Amino acid sequence: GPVCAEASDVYSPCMIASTPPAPFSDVTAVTFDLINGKITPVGDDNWNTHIYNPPIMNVLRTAAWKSGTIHVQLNVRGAGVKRADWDGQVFVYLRQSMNPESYDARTFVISQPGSAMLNFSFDIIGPNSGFEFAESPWANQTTWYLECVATNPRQIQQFEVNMRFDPNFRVAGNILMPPFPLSTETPPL
Amino acid sequence: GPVCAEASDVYSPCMIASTPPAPFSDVTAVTFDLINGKITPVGDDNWNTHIYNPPIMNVLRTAAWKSGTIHVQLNVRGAGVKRADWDGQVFVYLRQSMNPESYDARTFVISQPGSAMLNFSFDIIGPNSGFEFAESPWANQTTWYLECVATNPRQIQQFEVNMRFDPNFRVAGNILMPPFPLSTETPPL
Amino acid sequence: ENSLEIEELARFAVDEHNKKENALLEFVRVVKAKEQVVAGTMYYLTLEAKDGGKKKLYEAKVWVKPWENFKELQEFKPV
Amino acid sequence: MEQNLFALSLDDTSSVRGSLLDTKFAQTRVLLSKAMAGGDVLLDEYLYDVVNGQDFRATVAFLRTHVITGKIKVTATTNISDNSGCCLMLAINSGVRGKYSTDVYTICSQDSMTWNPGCKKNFSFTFNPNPCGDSWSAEMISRSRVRMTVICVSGWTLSPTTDVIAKLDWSIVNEKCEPTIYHLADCQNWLPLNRWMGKLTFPQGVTSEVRRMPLSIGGGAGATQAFLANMPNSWISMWRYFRGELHFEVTKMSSPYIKATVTFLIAFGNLSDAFGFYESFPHRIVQFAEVEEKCTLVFSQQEFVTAWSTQVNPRTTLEADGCPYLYAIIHDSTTGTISGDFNLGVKLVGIKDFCGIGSNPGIDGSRL
Amino acid sequence: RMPLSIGGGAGATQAFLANMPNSWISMWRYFRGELHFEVTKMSSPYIKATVTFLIAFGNLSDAFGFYESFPHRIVQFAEVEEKCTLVFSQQEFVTAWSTQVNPRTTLEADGCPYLYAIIHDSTTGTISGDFNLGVKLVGIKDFCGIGSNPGIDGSRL
Amino acid sequence: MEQNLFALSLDDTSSVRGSLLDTKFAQTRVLLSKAMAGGDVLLDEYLYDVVNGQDFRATVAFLRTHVITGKIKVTATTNISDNSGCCLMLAINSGVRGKYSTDVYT
């Protein structure tokens, strides 16, 4: 900055996770299963989570075998907190598995006050002619999780994971999913 | 910024170094031997260091002769310190050798509050048909160190060195290493 | 060894053991089966059964005369 | 005499092959209840659990052959008197997630046969259980959790005297396993879908029966405060607008005794019922014989001016909805000596010369 | 059983050992190829045994008596012969499999292939002593490495 | 799609054939005692009772094929150190009568 680059593309919002309400001050985290569309908060912290249903998410949930790059944009709001009093940071971690033994594939570290953005990507690639069935016992294939940590949940209000397929993306096969409930984005007045 | 570029690749975390606990306020430093995977803190400062065992690190430790570019991502956390009270800075220095006579190959200088990231790269290149045996007396070959300085260790909690081979990377030959202990990343709740 | 026949014989083992010894083992599956031609066929089975909801392995010996409806549990024991 | 055992042909990695007798690997016994309803799971098990407790010629070859380059043929030898009829649908899906929907809509995508026992004595169809490669194995499909599902989409129009059974015969034929891979090219020559456009009930009588099925297919099919999803239907909703030659496959689900003649046409939602001039539009008449059960409507590029939207807002009425519908109109009247509705199942097989425009942000809902 | 998820070293105490080439193959996530083993006799010629080798998955128990349904290779050694090369072509593997697996996965739920070594008859001899036999994966022909391993940290499966 | 089921190849009266893997139909386990004598029956069963409790590639083909024009190969993979040796004899006879002699001669 101060002059920006140029964002261009259509990224659809998949998964929001609002942070637990007052007086909960302790450090906390959440995990977005990027492929299977699930949001498991750590411990017994009452995060307020929603999974929306844009076409990207419906494909990622129903498609069995997947291949190629998906671009993510993690947005962070944002409580109305005086800039000089801000001490909140956000550590994120891409992971293959959610087991203790597995390592991170990427770490990011953000301490921008109020709000932040974080574009990254990663290639789903798998054994079966370049395709990956997420979490299949076959070949011990695994997903991609996105562990995210709010060091100060009083100041960080919510995470938000937007996604987009690169044009190289390819799926095959169907999974029988249950009926998806109609959760809608409550836009801010 | 405010709109970011786009991180893409798989960087595996190699070496963490947490900073000495209270009341230790003085300026301090640490050195990551990037190739041989060792973490020597300066003086008698009790830093809390760990070397993890992703495939990159195991190759760098066992491979004798190496050639080509490795990309590093140095992440810095990050104590919960009010942004207007932050005075901590981070000087880093690539070096060939750790002797007083040798000069730096690169210096970076960061004073971003809370947290920071720093991507750079460097090419391992050596005498023996472009290959470098790290720290061999032959041809007085040398490693690459990464000296890092926390001016305020109360505010800087920890360093973290992630790494990735460029596709041009090449090794040859084996070294008999001792058994690597199983240290695992303690992920933050 | 036809796996369908062996599955039925393994269930018969657990059922006969339950009748004979007043037990309530819950059949899970066959692990191993040996057929040995004799006067009829003798079967040596290795199988999983739940005791108190706890999976355990058992050996069973089952004698069949295929020309009659004769099936006889000769022995049944944990391995 | 002695021989060198290392050099024998015991590492034979051939696929399973031969006649249909020597490639059969399982038979399965489905029970059809005397009084079964629509949307009724008859069988639902993993495709590998089919082969448990089996002793056919290729059963052990199937389990132990590491690679199989041939497809799986399944044939179903179920029959019933012409008097009655129903509609069964067998269908293979690459996996599951807990508490799943078994509505015909959800299932049909991917690989399926649909047949009416009343008309067709038997029905066979081949498929590849690994949809993104030339090969597969028994160990692949056991651990991948490939799921076979038989469903009754329309009940018996006249119930039989007793319960019925459908014998499925699982074999391995020797066709090449070709993969079906969806991708994000804007222009594609053939985008298969197998999208269940809907079951059309027409009651017996005299009234103007008209049924609209919207061609804004994307964004799933409805439920309670919920919606269902195939993959291919979710895939087409990646794009905002689209067009192409649409290849429907309309199928009889009632018995041959319930007779009716059906006009199909493309047209827009504003047209009311009791508008008596549907045959001004270009249309296609569909009479079924006793024996015929299946008929393919195609609608060329001349039926559509522009592309239309993949999804529409749920609250748009028929009055203000500018995407095309597929009308299905009774040309005469639904008749028969026996009581029962004239059921009819439409299935968008695929879009030829598909052209997908733009990039859908998405809508969230289903019907229009 | 010897697992073909070879990557991430071999075990020790709370530790693991590493070659370079084995650490190198674990750079990739999934892989495949013609595997060229080199099985060697380590006991004397007097201890005699016949050994079937085959690729198969972990679920198969011991006391499952139909291993020769799978494609396999028999290995008898003469007095003078000491070394024999098993090759397993591309038709033995459907897809690629993972280089590393989590240590806590049991044999029941582990979808990578193993290399079984099964005694075809019985271990015999006039003199006492075990029938030792050393298997060494020499190399992978037509190697195809997929993806990019974040890593796992452990060894055996 | 439908097909005429009467005209399929389900009345295939081929013999069993293929590689040695796909024609294997049973394996048998004979126990040789540490101290065995001469004139000592190790195994003695009907040739059809060999195939009971078996699950090899040609086991079901063998039982169900009405005619087999091929011979039966049997191979015996038993070994022992050159130091020792014995003499086994496997042998097939078209039938029996009660309380039979199992002398090598017979």
Author numbering:
A (entry chain A), B (entry chain D): 1 to 189
C (entry chain C): 32 to 110
D (entry chain B): 1 to 368
E (entry chain E): 212 to 368
F (entry chain G): 1 to 106
Provide passages from the article that reported this PDB entry:
For this analysis we used Cowpea Mosaic Virus (CPMV), a plant virus from the order Picornavirales that has been used extensively in biotechnology and as a model for single-stranded RNA viruses more generally. Affimer proteins are novel affinity reagents which mimic the molecular recognition of antibodies, but can be isolated quickly and produced recombinantly. Affimer proteins are small (11 kDa, 3 nm in diameter), stable (70 °C < Tm < over 100 °C), monomeric proteins that lack disulphide bonds. Their structure consists of a single α-helix and four β-strands, with the molecular recognition sites being located within two variable loops, each up to nine amino acids in length. We have analysed the structure of CPMV in complex with the Affimer reagent using cryoEM revealing the binding site of the Affimer at the 2-fold symmetry axis of the viral capsid to the L subunit.
Anti-CPMV Affimer 3 was selected as it did not cause appreciable aggregation or clumping of CPMV particles in negative stain screens. To overcome this issue CPMV was applied to lacey carbon grids overlaid with a thin (<3 nm) layer of carbon. This causes the CPMV particles to be immobilized on the carbon support, anti-CPMV Affimer 3 was subsequently applied, excess solution was removed and the grid was finally washed prior to blotting and plunge freezing (see Methods and18 for more details). The global resolution of the resulting structure was 3.4 Å. The viral capsid has the highest resolution, and previous atomic models for the L and S subunit fit into the density with clear resolution of the bulky side-chains in both capsid proteins. The L subunits (green) interact at the 2-fold symmetry axis of the icosahedral capsid and here we can see additional density that is attributed to anti-CPMV Affimer 3 (purple). Due to the icosahedral averaging applied during image processing and structure determination, these locations have two-fold symmetry applied, which is appropriate for the viral CP, but not for the bound Affimer. As a result, the non-two-fold symmetric Affimer structure is inappropriately averaged meaning there is not clear density for the backbone of the Affimer and we are unable to map the position of individual amino acids. EM density is visualized for the alpha helical domain of the Affimer with the base of the helix bound at the interface between two L subunits. Previous structural analysis of Affimer proteins has shown the location of the variable loop. Due to the location of the variable loops, we propose that the N-terminus of the Affimer reagent is facing down into the capsid as this would allow the Affimer variable loops to bind to a portion of the L subunit in the CPMV capsid.
